[PDB]
Enzyme design. Structure first.
Site, PDB file in Angstrom:
ATOM      1  N   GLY A 291     -20.834 -14.273  30.824  1.00 34.19           N
ATOM      2  CA  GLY A 291     -19.486 -14.115  31.333  1.00 34.19           C
ATOM      3  C   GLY A 291     -19.332 -12.826  32.106  1.00 34.19           C
ATOM      4  O   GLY A 291     -20.254 -12.012  32.145  1.00 34.19           O
ATOM      5  N   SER A 292     -18.183 -12.655  32.749  1.00 36.18           N
ATOM      6  CA  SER A 292     -17.880 -11.415  33.449  1.00 36.18           C
ATOM      7  C   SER A 292     -16.386 -11.143  33.453  1.00 36.18           C
ATOM      8  O   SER A 292     -15.565 -12.063  33.366  1.00 36.18           O
ATOM      9  CB  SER A 292     -18.451 -11.411  34.879  1.00 36.18           C
ATOM     10  OG  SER A 292     -17.666 -12.185  35.775  1.00 36.18           O
TER      11      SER A 292
ATOM     12  N   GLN B 259     -13.496  -7.587  34.632  1.00 44.13           N
ATOM     13  CA  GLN B 259     -13.182  -6.646  35.701  1.00 44.13           C
ATOM     14  C   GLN B 259     -14.298  -5.658  36.016  1.00 44.13           C
ATOM     15  O   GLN B 259     -14.630  -5.454  37.184  1.00 44.13           O
ATOM     16  CB  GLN B 259     -11.892  -5.876  35.413  1.00 44.13           C
ATOM     17  CG  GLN B 259     -11.610  -4.803  36.458  1.00 44.13           C
ATOM     18  CD  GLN B 259     -10.136  -4.550  36.661  1.00 44.13           C
ATOM     19  OE1 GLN B 259      -9.358  -4.585  35.712  1.00 44.13           O
ATOM     20  NE2 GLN B 259      -9.742  -4.295  37.906  1.00 44.13           N
TER      21      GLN B 259
ATOM     22  N   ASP C 260      -8.013  -4.806  21.187  1.00 43.62           N
ATOM     23  CA  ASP C 260      -8.117  -5.921  22.131  1.00 43.62           C
ATOM     24  C   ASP C 260      -8.495  -7.213  21.415  1.00 43.62           C
ATOM     25  O   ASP C 260      -9.264  -8.017  21.934  1.00 43.62           O
ATOM     26  CB  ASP C 260      -9.146  -5.591  23.226  1.00 43.62           C
ATOM     27  CG  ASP C 260      -8.963  -6.413  24.507  1.00 43.62           C
ATOM     28  OD1 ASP C 260      -7.876  -6.986  24.742  1.00 43.62           O
ATOM     29  OD2 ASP C 260      -9.927  -6.449  25.307  1.00 43.62           O
TER      30      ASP C 260
ATOM     31  N   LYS D  74      -8.293 -10.923  20.370  1.00 49.91           N
ATOM     32  CA  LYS D  74      -7.795 -12.159  20.981  1.00 49.91           C
ATOM     33  C   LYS D  74      -8.928 -13.176  20.930  1.00 49.91           C
ATOM     34  O   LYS D  74     -10.075 -12.794  20.716  1.00 49.91           O
ATOM     35  CB  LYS D  74      -7.336 -11.899  22.420  1.00 49.91           C
ATOM     36  CG  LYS D  74      -8.424 -11.296  23.317  1.00 49.91           C
ATOM     37  CD  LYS D  74      -7.920 -11.072  24.733  1.00 49.91           C
ATOM     38  CE  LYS D  74      -8.997 -10.462  25.608  1.00 49.91           C
ATOM     39  NZ  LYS D  74      -8.499 -10.228  26.992  1.00 49.91           N
TER      40      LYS D  74
ATOM     41  N   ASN E 272     -12.306 -12.653  22.575  1.00 53.29           N
ATOM     42  CA  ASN E 272     -13.160 -11.603  22.009  1.00 53.29           C
ATOM     43  C   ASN E 272     -13.701 -11.917  20.615  1.00 53.29           C
ATOM     44  O   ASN E 272     -14.188 -11.030  19.907  1.00 53.29           O
ATOM     45  CB  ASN E 272     -12.433 -10.252  22.036  1.00 53.29           C
ATOM     46  CG  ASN E 272     -12.357  -9.676  23.431  1.00 53.29           C
ATOM     47  OD1 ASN E 272     -13.136 -10.059  24.306  1.00 53.29           O
ATOM     48  ND2 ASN E 272     -11.410  -8.773  23.659  1.00 53.29           N
TER      49      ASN E 272
ATOM     50  N   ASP F  71     -16.457  -6.961  22.301  1.00 58.46           N
ATOM     51  CA  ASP F  71     -15.667  -6.220  23.291  1.00 58.46           C
ATOM     52  C   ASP F  71     -14.891  -5.044  22.724  1.00 58.46           C
ATOM     53  O   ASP F  71     -13.661  -5.094  22.546  1.00 58.46           O
ATOM     54  CB  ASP F  71     -14.752  -7.114  24.127  1.00 58.46           C
ATOM     55  CG  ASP F  71     -14.273  -6.421  25.390  1.00 58.46           C
ATOM     56  OD1 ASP F  71     -14.528  -5.202  25.548  1.00 58.46           O
ATOM     57  OD2 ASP F  71     -13.636  -7.095  26.226  1.00 58.46           O
TER      58      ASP F  71
ATOM     59  N   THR G  91      -4.225  -7.218  26.625  1.00 62.42           N
ATOM     60  CA  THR G  91      -3.689  -8.446  27.214  1.00 62.42           C
ATOM     61  C   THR G  91      -2.265  -8.696  26.711  1.00 62.42           C
ATOM     62  O   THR G  91      -2.048  -8.759  25.504  1.00 62.42           O
ATOM     63  CB  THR G  91      -4.579  -9.665  26.870  1.00 62.42           C
ATOM     64  OG1 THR G  91      -5.893  -9.461  27.400  1.00 62.42           O
ATOM     65  CG2 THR G  91      -4.000 -10.945  27.452  1.00 62.42           C
TER      66      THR G  91
HETATM   67  O1  LIG Z   1     -17.908 -12.737  28.781  1.00 62.42           O
HETATM   68  C1  LIG Z   1     -18.237 -11.855  27.982  1.00 62.42           C
HETATM   69  C2  LIG Z   1     -19.193 -12.116  27.004  1.00 62.42           C
HETATM   70  C3  LIG Z   1     -19.530 -11.095  26.124  1.00 62.42           C
HETATM   71  C4  LIG Z   1     -20.511 -11.233  25.146  1.00 62.42           C
HETATM   72  C5  LIG Z   1     -20.938 -10.113  24.431  1.00 62.42           C
HETATM   73  C6  LIG Z   1     -21.941 -10.235  23.473  1.00 62.42           C
HETATM   74  C7  LIG Z   1     -22.521 -11.485  23.247  1.00 62.42           C
HETATM   75  O2  LIG Z   1     -23.506 -11.652  22.321  1.00 62.42           O
HETATM   76  C8  LIG Z   1     -22.099 -12.588  23.968  1.00 62.42           C
HETATM   77  C9  LIG Z   1     -21.106 -12.465  24.925  1.00 62.42           C
HETATM   78  O3  LIG Z   1     -18.988  -9.848  26.190  1.00 62.42           O
HETATM   79  C10 LIG Z   1     -18.100  -9.566  27.189  1.00 62.42           C
HETATM   80  C11 LIG Z   1     -17.590  -8.279  27.317  1.00 62.42           C
HETATM   81  C12 LIG Z   1     -16.699  -7.972  28.338  1.00 62.42           C
HETATM   82  O4  LIG Z   1     -16.215  -6.706  28.444  1.00 62.42           O
HETATM   83  C13 LIG Z   1     -16.314  -8.957  29.238  1.00 62.42           C
HETATM   84  C14 LIG Z   1     -16.835 -10.239  29.100  1.00 62.42           C
HETATM   85  O5  LIG Z   1     -16.495 -11.242  29.947  1.00 62.42           O
HETATM   86  C15 LIG Z   1     -17.717 -10.567  28.076  1.00 62.42           C
HETATM   87 CL   LIG Z   2     -19.039  -6.707  24.196  1.00 58.44          CL
END
Ligand SMILES: O=c1cc(-c2ccc(O)cc2)oc2cc(O)cc(O)c12
Ligand SMILES: [Cl-]
Length: 275
Positions: A19-20, A22, A137, A139, A142, A159, A178
């Site tokens: 994922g991504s 900002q 944060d 939600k 997360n 997160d 959020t």
């Molecule tokens: O889409 C995200 C996915 C993750 C994530 C973080 C650790 C994992 O084992 C799997 C996914 O962290 C994030 C942290 C962010 O700040 C933003 C994200 O989109 C994600």
């Molecule tokens: Cl994270």
């Protein structure tokens, strides 16, 4: 504090993007020396002091410092940190079952299913709050599932980009997440403590049980105004077969005065949760 500046590509191979957002992108990766798999979070650095783009060093270091402290089955753990001129790269535990947000989208839960998730969330937050760490944060996006194809999925909180140590009972920082999930003290730019997380848990619980968001307006400003006014209700269409105890739990979390709100310890002793 400085991080490993060898090229991360020398030690890891990346794969699927998870994922991504900002200022960060998360890629699945595999450590060459062990074959073990991780999530690599690439956090874009600020490249001038007065810029608004990227994440400040101070903010990156805070997230890393908090992550280094934590080890609990319901929170993500940090494996390594690398950096280069453009990014800090956190090598994090891989949680591959996707967001609680996506799990919820694909199917509202029974009270049993909701409490199965909620108890894990409460256990993770109990650990954090015990260490005086506010997440700020919380939600469904997360909360990540380890394996989504089991009847009682295990979760980990992720997160920590807004997380703070609360050594003085409160932080006064313009911390702001959020709109749907932030507590009134966040909306009002007031001193913030562990209590803000408990409000967020109330919102999450409402959503788990109903599929509906308690304060959501048509615009962000409406949502925020609703939060500050505690403008929510239990719609009969959604909550007609939900127990009064479940509603009680939510009602004691969605309380404007942080001092009157249930604490994490209160939430674990609440008759809806207490074994
Ligand atoms: O889409 C995200 C996915 C993750 C994530 C973080 C650790 C994992 O084992 C799997 C996914 O962290 C994030 C942290 C962010 O700040 C933003 C994200 O989109 C994600
Ligand atoms: Cl994270």
């Amino acid at each position: 504090t400085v991080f490993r500046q060898e090229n991360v590509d020398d030690y890891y191979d990346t794969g699927e993007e998870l994922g991504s957002g900002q200022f960060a992108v998360v890629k699945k990766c595999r450590e060459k020396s062990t074959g073990l798999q991780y999530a690599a979070k690439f956090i874009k650095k600020r490249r001038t002091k007065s810029s608004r783009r990227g994440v400040s060093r101070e903010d990156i270091e805070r997230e890393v410092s908090i992550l280094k402290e934590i080890q609990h089955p319901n929170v993500i753990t940090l494996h390594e940190v690398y950096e280069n001129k453009t990014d800090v790269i956190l090598i994090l535990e891989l949680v591959a079952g996707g967001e609680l947000f996506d799990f919820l989208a694909e199917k509202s839960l029974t009270e049993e299913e909701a409490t199965e998730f909620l108890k894990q969330i409460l256990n993770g937050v109990y650990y954090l709050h015990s260490l005086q760490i506010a997440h700020f944060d919380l939600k469904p996006e997360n909360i990540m599932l380890l394996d989504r194809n089991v009847p009682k999925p295990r979760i980990k909180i992720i997160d920590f980009g807004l997380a703070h140590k609360i050594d003085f009972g409160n932080e006064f920082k313009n911390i702001f997440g959020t709109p749907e999930f932030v507590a009134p003290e966040i909306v009002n730019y007031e001193p913030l403590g562990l209590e803000a997380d408990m409000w967020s848990i109330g919102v999450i619980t409402y959503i788990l049980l109903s599929g509906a968001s308690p304060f959501l307006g048509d615009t962000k400003q409406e949502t925020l105004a609703n939060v500050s006014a505690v403008n929510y209700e239990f719609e009969d269409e959604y909550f007609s077969n939900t127990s009064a105890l479940a509603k009680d739990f939510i009602r004691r979390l969605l309380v404007k005065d942080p001092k009157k709100r249930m604490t994490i310890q209160d939430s674990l002793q609440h008759p809806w949760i207490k074994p």
